[PDB]
Amino acid sequence: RTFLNLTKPLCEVNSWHILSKDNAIRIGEDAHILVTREPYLSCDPQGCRMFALSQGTTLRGRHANGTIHDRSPFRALISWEMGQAPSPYNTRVECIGWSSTSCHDGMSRMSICMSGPNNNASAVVWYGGRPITEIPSWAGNILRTQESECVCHKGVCPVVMTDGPANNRAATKIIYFKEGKIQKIEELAGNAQHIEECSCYGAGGVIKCICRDNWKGANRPVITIDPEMMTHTSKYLCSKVLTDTSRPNDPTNGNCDAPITGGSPDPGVKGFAFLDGENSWLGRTISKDSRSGYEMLKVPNAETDIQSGPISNQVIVNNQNWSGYSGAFIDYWANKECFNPCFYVELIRGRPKESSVLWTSNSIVALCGSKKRLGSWSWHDGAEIIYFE
Amino acid sequence: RTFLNLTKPLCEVNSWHILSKDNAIRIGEDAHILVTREPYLSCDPQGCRMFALSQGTTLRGRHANGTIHDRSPFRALISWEMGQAPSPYNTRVECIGWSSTSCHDGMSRMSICMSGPNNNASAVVWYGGRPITEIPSWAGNILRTQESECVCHKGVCPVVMTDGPANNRAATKIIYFKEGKIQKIEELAGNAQHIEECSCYGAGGVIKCICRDNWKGANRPVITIDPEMMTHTSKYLCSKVLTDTSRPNDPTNGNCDAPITGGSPDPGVKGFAFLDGENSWLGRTISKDSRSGYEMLKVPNAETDIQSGPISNQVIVNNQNWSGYSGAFIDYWANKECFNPCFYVELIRGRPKESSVLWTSNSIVALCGSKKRLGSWSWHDGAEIIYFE
Amino acid sequence: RTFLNLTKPLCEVNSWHILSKDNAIRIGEDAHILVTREPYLSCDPQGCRMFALSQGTTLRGRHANGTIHDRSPFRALISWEMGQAPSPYNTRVECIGWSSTSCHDGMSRMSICMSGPNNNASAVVWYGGRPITEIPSWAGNILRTQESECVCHKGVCPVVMTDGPANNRAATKIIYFKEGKIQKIEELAGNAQHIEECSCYGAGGVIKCICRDNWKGANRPVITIDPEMMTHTSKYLCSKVLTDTSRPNDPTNGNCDAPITGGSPDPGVKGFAFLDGENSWLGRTISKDSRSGYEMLKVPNAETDIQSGPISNQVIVNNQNWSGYSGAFIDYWANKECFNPCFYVELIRGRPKESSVLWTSNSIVALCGSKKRLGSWSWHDGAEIIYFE
Amino acid sequence: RTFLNLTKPLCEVNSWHILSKDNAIRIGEDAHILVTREPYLSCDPQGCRMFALSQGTTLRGRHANGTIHDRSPFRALISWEMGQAPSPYNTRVECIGWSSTSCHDGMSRMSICMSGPNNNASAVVWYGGRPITEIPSWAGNILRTQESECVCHKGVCPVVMTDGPANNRAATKIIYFKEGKIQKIEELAGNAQHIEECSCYGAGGVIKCICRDNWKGANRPVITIDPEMMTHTSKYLCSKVLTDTSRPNDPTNGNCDAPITGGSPDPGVKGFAFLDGENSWLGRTISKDSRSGYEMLKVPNAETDIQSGPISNQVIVNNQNWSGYSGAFIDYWANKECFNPCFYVELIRGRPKESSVLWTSNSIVALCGSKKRLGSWSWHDGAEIIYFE
Ligand SMILES: CC(=O)N[C@H]1[C@H]([C@H](O)[C@H](O)CO)O[C@@](O)(C(=O)O)C[C@@H]1O
Ligand SMILES: CC(=O)N[C@H]1[C@H]([C@H](O)[C@H](O)CO)O[C@@](O)(C(=O)O)C[C@@H]1O
Ligand SMILES: CC(=O)N[C@H]1[C@H]([C@H](O)[C@H](O)CO)O[C@@](O)(C(=O)O)C[C@@H]1O
Ligand SMILES: CC(=O)N[C@H]1[C@H]([C@H](O)[C@H](O)CO)O[C@@](O)(C(=O)O)C[C@@H]1O
Ligand SMILES: CC(=O)N[C@H]1[C@H]([C@H](O)[C@H](O)CO)O[C@@](O)(C(=O)O)C[C@@H]1O
Ligand SMILES: CC(=O)N[C@H]1[C@H]([C@H](O)[C@H](O)CO)O[C@@](O)(C(=O)O)C[C@@H]1O
Ligand SMILES: CC(=O)N[C@H]1[C@H]([C@H](O)[C@H](O)CO)O[C@@](O)(C(=O)O)C[C@@H]1O
Ligand SMILES: CC(=O)N[C@H]1[C@H]([C@H](O)[C@H](O)CO)O[C@@](O)(C(=O)O)C[C@@H]1O
Ligand SMILES: *[C@@H]1O[C@H](CO)[C@@H](O)[C@H](O)[C@H]1NC(C)=O
Ligand SMILES: [Ca+2]
Ligand SMILES: [Ca+2]
Ligand SMILES: [Ca+2]
Ligand SMILES: [Ca+2]
C-alpha cells in the first residue's frame, strides 16, 4: 500500500467495452432496492465500487413518492460492490447529505457529502471511514460538488466545489486535500464562467475536470489542475461538438474561451470527456434537448481545435431510451502501463419524463476503453414502466 | 491493539456536524427492518457501529403489534454497521434482554444485557462475544442499566446499574469491569437522589455520567468516576437550564445538590450533556412536556454554575417532530489530539404519541462536534405515518 | 491454531443464564426466514453458530406447506451466526440431507449429513468445507445420526450413528473421525438397548453421550466414549427421574442397566443431560405425554444412583408452550479453567400440535450454566399462530 | 499459492454422492431470488462456488415475464457461495453478457462473458476481478462459449468459442489464456463437425472437452487439448450410448469420426462425460426427446469402442421431472492424490415445457464421484408450478 501517483498516460481508445450494469430498476420492481440518483463508480487497490445518493427509501416503498426532489435530510452517499443493485442490505454509508464526491489515494478513501438547508449547507470530509474536516457554506446558496470521483496524486486529492447561483456568477473553489485535511484553497481562475458537477481524471501528473456550465454555455468548461503545485487554469472545450444538454445544433466553430449559448429547455447536465490530443473522446446525450440517448464521439484535438469534429462514434444508449448524468473514473490500480478511461451513464427512470409513477430513480451502466474495434448495442435501463403502474 | 486510556481532553465544540442517520422507519415501511428502541452508538479501533434493543419482529410484521411494551423474552441487544437500517440480515446479536450497555476497552468489546421477570432479572456480561459473568437482581425490581455506551480506561470499564422503584428511592450501583470480570462494586453515594439510564463519556482521566432522575428532579444527576481509584461522587447539574423531560420552566437558579422538581406529565427521559467549563453543551427535547424536537444549548459552566444560561443553540430536530432518548458516545480512537463529543437522538415513531398504528419503534440520527460554525437543519425521522395506516 | 484437548473439568452449575434466542417464527411471519427443524449450536475458536436442517423453503412460502415431513431431497444442514434467524441470505450450507451432526476439532469443522431413500441412505462427511468420505447404509433403514454437535479430542471426533428400525432393535455404530477420515468403527456394546440422536459433551478426557431409546426406555441411554483409546461402554441413566418424552410417572427406583418402559403416546424425543456426580443436571419436557414445556433439574448422582431425585429446578419454557428437541453443546474455546455446560431447546411451531397452519418449523433458545443463583422466566417461541392463519 | 497443474489422474468412480443443491425455485417462490439459466460450478483453493447467467430480475418480479429469451442487455454472469440460492444480496457480478465461462488458475479467477447484438458480439476477459482483454466477433453471428468452467494448467487456460450458424458449419476457435492475456488462437481441427457449449475437465496433463454438435450429431463431439503445447484434436464419442438430447434410440454401433443423425424435435443440449478407459461415465437426459430426467451411465471405453455399453447406472433426476444443461467441474485443490469428477444438472422450470407461467428459470443440483457403492434418489427441482399460477 502506497499513495497513487498519476505517473501513466491514457491508453489509446478506439472502442468502448461493457464493464458493469446493475439493472437496479428491473430488480427493484420486486426486490428491496433503494431509490437513488447522481451515481458514479470509483476504484481502489482491491477493485471498483458503485456510488450514489440514496433517497432513504426503497423504490417500491410508499416513500419513493416525491423523490424527484434533489435535497432532503433523508439522502446519503452509499457505496456497494460493482454490479449489484443498491439495497438496504448490501450498501455502505460513506456520508450523509445530498451532493458528494469520493476517491481513493492508494491508502484510504476520502468521501465528502454536503447537507443542510439551501442558505446554510456544510460539507463533511471523511477519510478511512472517519470524519476529518467540516466546511461551512461560503456563499449561502447550496454548497455542492462533483457527483463523481475525485482524483489523487502523491496523497493530494483536489476537489471542485461550487456555492452560489445556478443561473448566475457563482463562487467556485478548488480545495486540495490530503488524508481529509485541507492543504490549500484556491478560488476558481481562468475563462470558465460557471462550474458545476466536474467529472475528473488524471494522467501524466495532470488532472482534467470537464464540467457543467449551468449559466450560459452549451460547451463544457475544462479545468486543468496540477496536484503537485496545487494550481489550476480554466477555459472551455474548444470543439464545435457541443456536449452539454439542451444545446443548439453544433456550430461551424466552437469557442475555447467563452460559453456558446442556446438550447431548450434544460440549462445543463453532468458530463465528461477524455482529452488526449488525437486520442480524445466526448460523451453527450444524443438528444440535443433532453436526457435521452448517449453517444461517445472520438474528436481528435477537441481540447485545442475549434474546428475539431468526430472521426468515430459509438451509441451507448439509443435515443429511444432515457439517460442522465455521465462522468469519468479510472481504475488507476490496474495492471497496465497506461491508465484506461472508463465512464458511467446514469439511466434515469421516473419523473419528470415518465410521470405515470410518483418516484424518480435510476440504474447504472459503465464502460471502459478498448484498443480493439468492438461491436456495440444499447445498454438501456431495461425496465417496463407499465409494471410500476 | 492496547487498552484505551482516557489521556486526551475534549475537543472544542462550537456547532455539530452530521455523522449518520439510518432512516430506519422510512426504509422499514417496505424492507425487512426490525422494530427497535433504546438505540445508541459505540466505536472501537476500526470504526463506529449502531446498537439498539430489538423487539424480535419487523416493523411491517404482525408481531410489531404490541411493541410499546418495554420488556419481553423476545428482545435482544443488536449492533450493525453505522448508517445502515437494522434488518434481520445485517445485525449482530450482542446479548439477550431488554436493557443494556456496551463499550470497547481497546482490545475487545464488553456487552451487558438484563433479562427476566421484574422481580428476578439478571445481567449477563459479555466480552469478546463470549459470556463472562452473571449478576442477579439485588432489589428484585427490574435490574436495569445505561441504554447507551460505557467507557473504559486501562481496561477498567465502570457501568452504572439500578434496581428498585422507578418512582421512589432505589438501589444504584457502579460496577467496575475488566475483561468482563467484576473488579469492584460500589453503592451509589453523594447527592443524586435517583439514578437511571446514564450517558457517560471520558476525557482527561475522568468519566462523567449524565443521568435520569425519574423520581424527583427535572435537572439531571451527574456522577463523576475515577476509573483508576474506582470511586465516584454524585450531585446534580448546577445549571438553571433544565434538561429532563416533563420539566417546568427553567427557574432563576438551578441547584447543584438537590433536585428541581415539577413538570408534567412524565417523570423522565434518558438524556446527556458534555461538561468541560466554558466548552459545555446540554441537549434536551424542545418541548418541556413531551419527547418532541431536540436542541443543543451551549451553556458555559453548566456543571458548576447555578446561574449559567445558553450562549448558543442548534436545533437538531424541529418541534413539529418526535424525538426520544439521547445519549453520548465518542470515537476515542480517532486520529485527533482531543476526544470529540458525539451524540445520538432516538426518533420514536408510533405509540403512544401516534396511535393510528399498533406499534412503537425508532430511527436514529447522530452528530459530532465541530470547531467551525456550521449551518444546521432538522434531522427528523422523515416517515409518513399515514403510509402505515 | 491447535487440536482441541478435553482436559478441563466441567464447571460447577447452580442455575442457567440466557445465551441466545433467535425468535425465528416471530421474525419469519414477515421476513424471509427458512423453514427448519432439528437445530443445535456448535462453537469453534472464534465463536458459536446455530445449526439446523432447512426444508428448502421460507416459512411464509407456499412450499412451507407439508413441511411436517422429516425427509426430502430439499433439506440441508445450514449454519449461521448465533442469534440471527436463518434466512436464505445469511446461512451457510454445511451439507445436503435430512439428518446431521457437526463439530470443530480446533483446526477445522467436520459436518456430516445423511440423505437418500429410506432403504438406501448415505452419509457424506465434510471437513474444512470439502467432502471427505461417504458411508453407505449398513442396515437399509434410514441411516441417521445425532442432530446436535459431536466432540473432538486431539483431532479424533467420535460420532454415534444408527441404522435400523425405530421401534425395534437397530444397528448402532461409533465412528471415530480425524480430518473427516474414518480412524475406527465400533458396533454399539453395553446395556443400552436402542440408540438415537445422541447429545454429547466432553470433560476430563471423557465424552458422554446422552441419547434417545425409541424402542423401550423412558429413561435415557448413556454412552461413555474414550476418544484416545477409541472405545466405549453403554448403559442407562440410573436416576428414577425419567427424561424422555411420553414417559410414565417417575417410579420409586430407576434402573442403571435396563429400560424403564411405559408412557403414551410417543416413543421418544431427543434430549440431553450433564453428568458430574453432585454437579448433575437433567433436562426434560414438563409434560410427560407431549413435547410441551421444558425444565432443568439438578439431580445429584443421576448417573450412578437409582434413587436420585431433584434438589433444584429451573423452568426454561412454561408448560403452556411447545418445546421439542433439546441437546448439549459447550464453548470448549472459552477463556475459563472449566468447560461450562450449555444447551438449546427447539421450539416447534405448527403441525401436528398446531393444525391451523400447513407447516412445521421451530425457533431456538439456548442457555449456559452459572455458579450463581439466577432468577428465571420462560423463553417460549413467542409467535402468535393466529397471525399465520 | 501457485499455478495449478493437471498431473494427477482421475479418481475411480463407482457411484455419485450429493455435493450441493440450492432449491432456488422453491425458495424463490417467496424470497427475492434472481431469474437465471446456464448455471455451473467452479472451484478454487478455498472451495467451490455456483455460477449462472442472471436475467436481471427476480423470479416473482414482473420482469420475469419473457425470460425464455436467451440474450438481452440485462443478463450477467453471477457467482455465489455454493448451496445458497442466487439473490440480489449474495451474488457477485463476474462480468456482463449472455454467454460465459470461468476458471481459477490457482492464483486468480478468469471470467469471460459475451454481450452485444447477434451480428456484433464481443467477449470481455476478466482476471482477478479486472477486465484484461476484449475479443470482437469474427463470424458476426452470436459469438459464444462454454456455459461451464474452463480448466487451467501451469498458468494456461484454454477456452473453446464458437461464432457462426447454430444449424450449420460454424467457426470454432480455441483460445489459450494466461492471466487473461491471449497466448494463442487456433481454428478448430479434426473430425468434430460442429461445436457448442463444451464441458471440460483435466487429468494426466490433458484437458478433454465434451461438447454439443447442434448441427447434425446425436453423439457428442470430444476435443482433446494439450495445455502445454497449446494444441488440440477433435472427434466424436465412439460409444453407441448416444448422449445428446433429441436423439434416436441407441444404434448397435456408435461412430468415432462422424455425427450420428436423427432424433426430434431439438437439435441439442449442453452435456458432459468423463472419459478414462474403464473408469468412464456418460451423463444424459432420460428422455431421448426432451430435457427430462437425468441419468449417469458407466460406459467402459466409451471414448474408443463403438460397441461400448453401460455396466452400471444411477438416476440423478427421475423422468417425471425436468432437467436441462449439465456440465463438468472438479475441485482440483482437494486434498487427494487424484482428481475426483463432479457434475451439475440444471433443473429448468417454466417455459417452454411449463407454459402456465410467463418465465423460465432453473435451480441446481451437483454431485461428485465416490469409490463406494452409495444408494441414490431423484434430486429434482421440487417446486410446485401451481403455486406460481
Ligand atoms: C445539489 C443539487 O441539488 N444538485 C442538483 C443539480 C442542480 O440542480 C444544478 O446543478 C443547478 O445547480 O442538478 C440536478 O438538480 C439536475 O439537474 O438533475 C441534480 C442535482 O441533485
Ligand atoms: C426517451 C425518448 O423518448 N426521447 C425522445 C425525446 C423525448 O420524447 C422528449 O425529449 C420529451 O420531452 O424527444 C426527442 O425528440 C429527443 O429529445 O431526442 C426524440 C427522443 O426519441
Ligand atoms: C428497563 C426498562 O423497562 N426501561 C424503560 C425505562 C423505564 O420505564 C424508566 O426508566 C423507569 O424506570 O424507560 C422507558 O420505559 C421509557 O421511559 O420509555 C423505556 C425503557 O425501556
Ligand atoms: C411533535 C409535536 O407535534 N409536538 C407538539 C407538541 C405535542 O403535540 C404534544 O407534546 C403532544 O402531547 O405540543 C407542543 O405544544 C409541544 O409539546 O411543544 C407543540 C409541539 O409542536
Ligand atoms: C432421520 C429422521 O427422520 N429423524 C426423525 C426422528 C425419527 O423419526 C425417530 O428418531 C425414529 O427413528 O425423529 C423425528 O421423526 C421426530 O420424532 O420428530 C424427527 C427426525 O427428523
Ligand atoms: C403446550 C400445551 O398446551 N401443553 C398442555 C398439554 C398439551 O395440550 C397436550 O400434551 C397435547 O396432547 O396438555 C397438558 O395436560 C400437559 O401435557 O401437561 C397441559 C399442558 O398445558
Ligand atoms: C448464446 C446463446 O444464446 N446460447 C443459447 C444456446 C444456443 O441457442 C444454442 O447453443 C445454439 O447455438 O442454447 C440455448 O439457446 C438452449 O438450447 O437452451 C440456451 C443458450 O442461452
Ligand atoms: C418431465 C416429464 O413429464 N417428462 C415426460 C416427457 C415429456 O412430457 C415430453 O418430453 C414433453 O415433450 O414425455 C415422456 O414420454 C418422455 O419424454 O420420456 C415421458 C416423461 O415422463
Ligand atoms: C505440479 O504441482 C506439484 C505440486 O505443487 C509439483 O510438485 C510439481 O512440480 C508440479 N509439476 C509440474 C510439471 O509443474
Ligand atoms: Ca449549459
Ligand atoms: Ca425527572
Ligand atoms: Ca423412549
Ligand atoms: Ca445434436
Short description:
The structure is a homotetramer of 389-residue chains. The first copy, chain A, has a single domain (1-389), classed as Neuraminidase (6 Propeller), CATH 2.120.10.
Characterize the quaternary organization of these chains: homotetramer
Assign the structural class of chain A, choosing from mainly alpha, mainly beta, alpha/beta, alpha+beta, or little secondary structure: mainly beta
Question: What is the CATH-assigned architecture of chain A?
Answer: 6 Propeller
Q: Percent helix among the residues of chain A?
A: under 10%
**Strand order within the widest beta sheet of chain A:** 1-23-22-21
SSE run of chain A: EHEEEEEEEEEEEEEEEEEEEEEE
Enumerate the distinct ligands: N-acetyl-alpha-neuraminic acid, 2-acetamido-2-deoxy-beta-D-glucopyranose, calcium ion
Taking the alpha carbons of the first and last residues of chain A, their distance comes to: 50 Å
Sheet-strand content of chain A, in percent, reads 35-45%
CATH level-3 fold name of chain A: Neuraminidase
What can be said about the biggest beta sheet of chain A? 4 strands, antiparallel
What is the CATH C level class of chain A, in words?
Mainly Beta
Q: Provide a count of the helices of chain A.
A: 1
Describe the global form of chain A: globular
The domain tally of chain A reads 1
Q: What is the radius of gyration of chain A computed over CA atoms, rounded to a whole number of angstroms?
A: 19 Å
According to DSSP, the number of beta strands of chain A is 23
Main interface by residue count:
B-C, 39 and 40 residues
PDB class: hydrolase
Keywords: HB site, sialic acid, subtype N6, hydrolase
Assembly: tetrameric
Entry title: Structure of Neuraminidase from English duck subtype N6 complexed with 30 mM sialic acid (NANA, Neu5Ac), crystal soaked for 3 hours at 291 K
